[PDB]
Amino acid sequence: RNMFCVKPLDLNLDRHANTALVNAVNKLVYTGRLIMNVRRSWEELERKCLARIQERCKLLVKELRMCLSFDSNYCRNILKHAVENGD
C-alpha cells in the first residue's frame, strides 16, 4: 500500500526456542520478502503511470492534428518525444 515508509522487524522474530540457523534464515527471508515487495510495488506504479501518460499522448496527438496550424505543429513537435522512461 505504501512503498515509501520502511518498517523493518516490527515484532520479535528472533526466537531462542528454534535453531539459530532457522532464525537467521527467517530474518533473511523477511528481508527478501520486503525487498521483492517494494520492487513489485514500485514497478507496478510506474507502469500504470507510464501507460496512462502514453495513452494521453496518443489521444492528444490524435486530437490536435485535425486542425493544421503553427501552434499545433509546435505542440506536436514537443509531443513527438518518447515517454517510456523517467528521464
Partner: protein, 141 residues
C-alpha cells in the same frame, strides 16, 4: 605443594596430618618431610599452566554435562562428585563435530601434559609373584 602457597605454617601443619596417611592395600605409609623446592615450583608452574589451558579449551557441553546429568539422573557417585562442585530443557547454542573433535584432541593433549607429573614411569610389569609375596617375575626392563 599447591596448598603451600599463601597459607599459614600451622595450616600446613594441619594439612600434613591429613595428607601423610596413605593406607594402600591394607598397609599404612607416611610421607616424609614435605617441603618447598624449586623443582616443585616447576611442577606447580606447569600444573597451573595446563590447568589454565584446559580451562580455556573446555567447551560448554563438557562444562554442562555434570548439570545435565544431575538434573535427571541420581546415584551415590553423582552425589559424592556433586558436593565438591559449586552452586551456579534448553537447546545448545552452537555445536559442530569437526571443531569439537579438534577441541577434544587438544584437550587430551593438555590432560596428558597434566598426567605426566604424577605418573613417573613403568619399569616393571609383573607376571607371577611368589606366593609368600617375597619375589616376582617381570618384563619390560
Amino acid at each position: 605443594g599447591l596448598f603451600s602457597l599463601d597459607r599459614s605454617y600451622e595450616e600446613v601443619k594441619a594439612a600434613v596430618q591429613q595428607l601423610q596417611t596413605i593406607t594402600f592395600r591394607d598397609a599404612t605409609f607416611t610421607i616424609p618431610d614435605p617441603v618447598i623446592d624449586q623443582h616443585l615450583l616447576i611442577d606447580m608452574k606447569t600444573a597451573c599452566l595446563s590447568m589454565s589451558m584446559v580451562a580455556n579449551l573446555a567447551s560448554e557441553l563438557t562444562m554442562t554435562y555434570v548439570r545435565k546429568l544431575a538434573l535427571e539422573d541420581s546415584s551415590m557417585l553423582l552425589v559424592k562428585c556433586q558436593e565438591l562442585l559449586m552452586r551456579l530443557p534448553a537447546r545448545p547454542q552452537h555445536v559442530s563435530p569437526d571443531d569439537e573433535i579438534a577441541r577434544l584432541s587438544a584437550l587430551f593433549v593438555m590432560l596428558r601434559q597434566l598426567d605426566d607429573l604424577i605418573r613417573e614411569q613403568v619399569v616393571f610389569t609383573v607376571c607371577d609373584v611368589s606366593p609368600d609375596n617375597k619375589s616376582a617375575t617381570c618384563i619390560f626392563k
